Ligand binder design. Sequence first.
Ligand SMILES: Nc1ncnc2c1ncn2[C@@H]1O[C@H](COP(=O)(O)OP(=O)(O)OP(=O)(O)O)[C@@H](O)[C@H]1O
Ligand SMILES: Nc1ncnc2c1ncn2[C@@H]1O[C@H](COP(=O)(O)OP(=O)(O)OP(=O)(O)O)[C@@H](O)[C@H]1O
Ligand SMILES: OC[C@H]1O[C@H](O)[C@H](O)[C@@H]1O
Ligand code: NA
Ligand code: NA
Lengths: 312, 313
Amino acid sequence: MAPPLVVVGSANADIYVEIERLPKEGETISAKTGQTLAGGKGANQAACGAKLMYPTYFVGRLGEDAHGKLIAEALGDDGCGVHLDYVRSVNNEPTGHAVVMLQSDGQNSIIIVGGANMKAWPEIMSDDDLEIVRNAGIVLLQREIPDSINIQVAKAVKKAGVPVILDVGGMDTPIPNELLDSIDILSPNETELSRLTGMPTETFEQISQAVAKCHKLGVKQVLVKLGSKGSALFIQGEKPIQQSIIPAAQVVDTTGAGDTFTAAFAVAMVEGKSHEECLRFAAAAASLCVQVKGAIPSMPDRKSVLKLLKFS
Amino acid sequence: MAPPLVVVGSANADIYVEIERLPKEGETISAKTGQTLAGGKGANQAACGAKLMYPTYFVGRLGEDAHGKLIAEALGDDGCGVHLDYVRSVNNEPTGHAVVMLQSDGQNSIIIVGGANMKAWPEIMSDDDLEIVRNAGIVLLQREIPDSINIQVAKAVKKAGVPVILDVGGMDTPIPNELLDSIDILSPNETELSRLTGMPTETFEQISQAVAKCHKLGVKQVLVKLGSKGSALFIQGEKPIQQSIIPAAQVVDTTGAGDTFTAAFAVAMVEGKSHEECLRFAAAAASLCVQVKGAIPSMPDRKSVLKLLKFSI
Ligand SMILES: Nc1ncnc2c1ncn2[C@@H]1O[C@H](COP(=O)(O)OP(=O)(O)OP(=O)(O)O)[C@@H](O)[C@H]1O
Ligand SMILES: Nc1ncnc2c1ncn2[C@@H]1O[C@H](COP(=O)(O)OP(=O)(O)OP(=O)(O)O)[C@@H](O)[C@H]1O
Ligand SMILES: OC[C@H]1O[C@H](O)[C@H](O)[C@@H]1O
Ligand code: NA
Ligand code: NA
């Protein structure tokens, strides 16, 4: 009954097919194999939070189709234990999905269908949806749903005094200043930090500088994801702190690990942990995540993260 | 219950994405929209039979997943009314699926995942897997499950005396002669007939000679689908029967129409109708199919097929 993690964002069916080579206009080919998996940054972050045994709601839009049931199954009672009260399904849009064509040479080809993620939201968020974010302990957004929705959520949480984190992952359009001005923590990776600031991010000094531009744009806190280099938390009026990776024994699959990092950070934060302990909690979670194939099935339970953290 | 139509074959979730152009290696693109629908040649044919009010069983393999559920729902008691007793689901293979990339010009590019359709069958069919085919009034196969399974089913019927139809739709591989020798009716389109015989099929004379080649490969009856030109039924030693299309008011989506044609022909044949009547009935059912989007959603009910027959000649 603690103030919940509330994730508002995307849910996707990820349709992976293993093919020797791409087809041609008319060519029917046969994949070696194929699998369809629950994904999307919003669903991933919600799954992570629920698996960490923190009360978590997902606010998203699905189609009334098989891929929608796939997501609900993965996230809900028989899966991760996300509260799905505020997920709505519609009959005029497909569940969002991605066709991923892994090829016999190492190259990926992807078709992304935004579907319900981009087209099933209302013009104006319902009072019901806004009520769950007002009652949240913390709110997580990404950029795989319309700016309109992110902005309306951001405004409500700001008035309610609820912290909100915006993951920059998703579409590569500019971020509206009204969104930047209404969020507590911006969370880009190195490449995303560069794209929105038009500055280099090859060195930590360059990163600090792009982050300085972020402060000027209205963002008091930036949680920078650095891949193998770990992460860095920048708070205006303070010294940037850093956390290196907690090295994985083996990197099986980095899919979902940035989402795990972000959501785990949010869980540690809302649990009242220090900034240092938040970064380390998140590092530990991302680390367990990359050691296992897949996205949502790779995400660690609280017991495993805490176990890994114990090590000296 | 009349001796049922028994369809042994494939079930696919059909994943349609509308794009402008096919993407390139390393490249991410966006689609305008999409839809996931119940399909597969086997499930389509069973759905058709069931909608035409003939007792119909589907024998097939599904994964225990959301795509599998989609199929079951579309075919079963709340959908088409297919008897699903002999559908089996496995947890170690995915339900087969097909990514169908529609382009703006008109071409389609397709990736087919065999999944449970190709990989979840036993090496040897058990005799109570085969009990249903032994009780059939007519059996329909396609080429979207393993050759080995098709061979075992056909042989189990031949040694029981009921007609077996093999739709050539599916894999583009040569058909094993062991299979051709065990079926009663082969049903290819023009391209499949040409691929299988290695002969041209651009003219009716050519088609007739390609069919003569089929008669040499041991097949007595060939039901050739000729697209906008209609169809024809060749029976060895007899004059061919030709049937033009029953023209559709509008063509919305031809997906599943060949499946409809073949299954409707089978229903008419198992009900005792004349070859002429069988072809007409099949043409009418395919006509209705092309006027609605989707495969299984577009299957017509028997009354509509008979009404189109009444008023079309
Ligand atoms: N060998 C590793 N061991 C432990 N953690 C790792 C390892 N490699 C990457 N990570 C961590 O897993 C997460 C995902 O890394 P990844 O490189 O895929 O993306 P990122 O740049 O960090 O962030 P984003 O998801 O926004 O792209 C990150 O939190 C990263 O710190
Ligand atoms: N305008 C139309 N009106 C009525 N029937 C049509 C029309 N166009 C195609 N058909 C019929 O729908 C069925 C499928 O037609 P299509 O052209 O898609 O391929 P086909 O070669 O005949 O069969 P297959 O699906 O096996 O390739 C056929 O029975 C065809 O005769
Ligand atoms: O004939 C139609 C079927 O062929 C392919 O198998 C598609 O899945 C489609 O439903
Ligand atoms: Na992973
Ligand atoms: Na159709």
